[model samples]
Target chain A: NIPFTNNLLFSGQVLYGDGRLTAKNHQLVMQGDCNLVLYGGKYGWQSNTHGNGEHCFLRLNHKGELIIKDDDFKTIWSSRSSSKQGEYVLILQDDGFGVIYGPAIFETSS
Target chain B: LGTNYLLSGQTLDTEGHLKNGDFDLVMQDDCNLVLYNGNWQSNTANNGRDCKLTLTDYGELVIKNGDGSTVWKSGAQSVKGNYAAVVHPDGRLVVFGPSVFKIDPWVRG
Candidate 1:
């Protein structure tokens, strides 16, 4: 586990192995491999919201903005990014699309 | 058995549809299994998101949602039996089935 120290919920909070509204046994972790995972007990990764390369870190702009940085200190990823912005903490929603709610910046593409 | 997600040889006939809540897995013909939300499609593929997205009982579980785009695929691959893929609501490529069709441990999220 990379340690869920910060980033909205990825910022701090934990659960997964049961079901509920906040902290049901839904396991979410920032992995040693530098991947962020939100998993259900039987189901798996709710999203492929990976930072691409490892030794990565998550940052919050304090203004509800989120950022993902690489080991090189190069800003590799950003959240609440330019997909059009609004002030809302990120979520690993259980909806479809994995509904893959990823906060990526440089792994940019369609 | 769920979502149009398939295991080789499984076909989503012209009208043969698979359902994942509001979505439909229609064979839209052209020999492909497609995920649809009314008129919305995963746009990218094996064309309309595929080409027999099978686990091959070999190596690889592929999701061709187009642009010849691979929304997801195996880093390695396989199975002694059959496996199934669901266009996971998690935006993650998730497969669930029996033990006979064991998967690559790395394939799990």
Candidate 2:
């Protein structure tokens, strides 16, 4: 299992043993600019080892979004929101909730 | 099912009307399936020319004219690292890695 630290969120790959987002392969690769908000429960991609491959292993639940690009610097997946901008902080809780917070703002939206 | 073949060229119909569209010739890794012109055509000339090879979940590869309209495309494909290539506005070609960018000029042999 992998540990979810403040630094890990910016650079790491999340892996799962079953259909769930296990804390196994969490390692940061690069520092991301925007924040990541995991909403509607834990969501992301499940590996083939898990029989069911149709589940969200990673999640983003917030007002703003993050643009995920590949090694080629091409846009692959994005949070699809440009509402909030600027340097933000990402928080991953123990029960599998990823949240983002601004320096002077920490308001939660419904 | 019968064997699959892939063909590519400027002409669409060999003996009939010339299909002006730039065709694609694909041969899979195992050489089992071949897709040509977006179909399971014949596998006679199994050449992978101008064919969008592999598409990851987060990236895309497309062929377009000078007018910016797409002629062929590989939708949002994603890979671990960067894999985008484009012709720059100044006519300089560029290639991206998972991290950095490099210059790749269009050269003819």
Candidate closest to the true structure, highest lDDT:
1
Q: Kindly list the per-residue Cα lDDT of model 1 for residues A77-104, writing each as its tens digit.
A: 4444333222112333222111212222
Candidate 2 local lDDT, A11-110, one digit each (tens): 2333222212222223212223222222223242211122222222332223334334433444434545333333222333233333332211211111
lDDT score at residue B14, model 2, on the 0-100 scale: 20
DockQ of all models, two decimals each: 0.02, 0.01
In order, how many clashes per candidate? 24, 42
**Per-prediction share of native contacts kept:** 0.01, 0.00
Chain A TM-scores of all predicted models? 0.43, 0.38
Candidate 1 residues B31-71, lDDT tens each? Answer: 34355644434343344523334444442444443243444
lDDT of each: 0.37, 0.27
